[PDB]
Amino acid sequence: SHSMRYFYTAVSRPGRGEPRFIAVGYVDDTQFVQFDSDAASPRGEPRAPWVEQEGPEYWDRETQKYKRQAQTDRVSLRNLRGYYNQSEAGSHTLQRMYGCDLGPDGRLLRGYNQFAYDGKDYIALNEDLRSWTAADKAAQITQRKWEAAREAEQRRAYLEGTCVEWLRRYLENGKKTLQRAEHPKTHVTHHPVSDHEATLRCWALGFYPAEITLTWQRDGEDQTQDTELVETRPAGDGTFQKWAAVVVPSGEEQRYTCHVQHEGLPEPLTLRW
Amino acid sequence: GITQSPRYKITETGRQVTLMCHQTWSHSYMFWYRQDLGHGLRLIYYSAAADITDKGEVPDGYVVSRSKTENFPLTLESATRSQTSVYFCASSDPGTEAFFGQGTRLTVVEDLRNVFPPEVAVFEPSEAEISHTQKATLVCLATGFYPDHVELSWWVNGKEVHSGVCTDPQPLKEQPALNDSRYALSSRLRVSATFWQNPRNHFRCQVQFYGLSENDEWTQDRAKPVTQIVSAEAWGRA
Amino acid sequence: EVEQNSGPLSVPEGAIASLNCTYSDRGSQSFFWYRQYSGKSPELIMFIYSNGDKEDGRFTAQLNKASQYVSLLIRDSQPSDSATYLCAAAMDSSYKLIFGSGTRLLVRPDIQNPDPAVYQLRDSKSSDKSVCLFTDFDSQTNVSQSKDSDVYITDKCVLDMRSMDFKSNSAVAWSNKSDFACANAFNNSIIPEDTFFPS
């Protein structure tokens, strides 16, 4: 499955003027555009090669989109402060996340668009793309405003059509890197925890996309409780890393097997040291 | 709201003219439009945000700038015969509804002397008309006004009336020579015959004519044709 | 580029009236319908961005987007509604909003027991002119141009009176010529011969 995601963050700084705005765009797990309002020269910057060959007028238009959204967000900050009637000397964060997930039939599978204030869910567009979900009472005010102003129709128009067109275009323009899957290179290591105890660590590197599943099974027992996991981390070259460890008694190492599941691998792999 | 500076303007050929547009909504997008009924309403230039101006379908002979975010002036360097039209200045967010002001009626003429105000006269109804219909129809007529920069209003006892009133949508050319023709306009006002028979009522047809600006020089012996109001009055009899 | 239904239409009895517009650059995603009165600035009534049809009081609209035929229409008509109707669309990239050729719409109101007639109106003494007016005729009737060079006649017009709950049409003709006759003045009457010709 493929998808396109957009993340906006507006951090309000009081006493130093206008808030800082940062916008990033992800196709699946590769970044392609990012814009910063506090940069030396505020303009849309490409981080993926397949958008770098895009026309300059496209970059101008995208920069205008982002600048307009920055102004819109500063007003939202002020409006939200007014809604909570909070002091003007406090910093506040507003986050916006929207994207669309393509289905297996080459058409829209789902879309999402939601806002959050100071790390708390504020409002979310329902899956029907025609109603809203307000978390608290102040979000009901925005629900009123947008239901009366019919913003849901605008958002659905963006999610059902143009986002899919953009996604397909980007996929075709960069199918060599966005449609490819790098199978993870894996290996298992061990270290001594004690004289009669030892830690086994399954490692997986160089895979795309980030989604992967590592599990430890004891002769058929897949218990996560003793397993130690870490968040999947990027290597910095477009590929991600992940490892999973378990502490075992020496001599019972032969009964344990790591299991790795990933798109790049045709069949799930079983590993042992 | 939105405001277009000149509601009506008349200028000679070869003299640049500027139209000011102002908006209070602080909309990002602003556009200029021309309507003269030939193709409908076409675009000229459109500006997004500030200091950015891109062209439209009819951009030749037009110059624009965007210094402020709320002002989008339109300039015509050399006025021509083709440029006579009705200009509109609109403003909106990128995908929201567009908002434009009242509009600017512009006419470019060869010679300043050709401008002439209307002569107006109100004609009283026929006695046979009220005899059969039991209702009277007064008629107002303005003639000899060039160009079509007039607005007609009926007034009854110091009150501009709107019911039972008709006005010709567009004026008729006196002589259809198609190089220079003076226009004629008409209007009707229908009321009850009993109302017309009372002598106390007073009917007054009024025509505002937006002519030359005062600054434009005038040498002809005839009275200078500046913006003026010409009215004709009548009373009920018998 | 957008091409609207520029050919004018006039539907007399209150009933469905339909009008559509087609665009040649399939990339829009933004659509609107404007209404403009003669001499006034147009006004929005409907906006649409999604293929699904939308309802609005006496109005509705829909966008196929493959056919790309935008449709607005009215459930029942009134004389007031008659105006110019403009189609507009904005590209999803430049966000330039372009209008199509306006579709003039004229209503013809039904007249209950009309008594068509022609009258002559004497002017005020300083006016120095004479004229004739033809009124209270059926809406279907059309008005013809003057064959004579020196005779000027205006087009038909509708007025409504809320006080007497009555509506009527009018047409006016005048000439500076000497041999001005009302009967003679309307040379191409082309109307049912139920006309009064006073002095």
Binding site: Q64, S76, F115, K145 | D93 | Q29
Partner: peptide, 10 residues
């Protein structure tokens, strides 16, 4: 492409 159709406001 970004979702820059209307004024999201709040």
């Amino acid at each position: 492409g970004a979702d820059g159709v209307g004024k999201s406001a709040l």
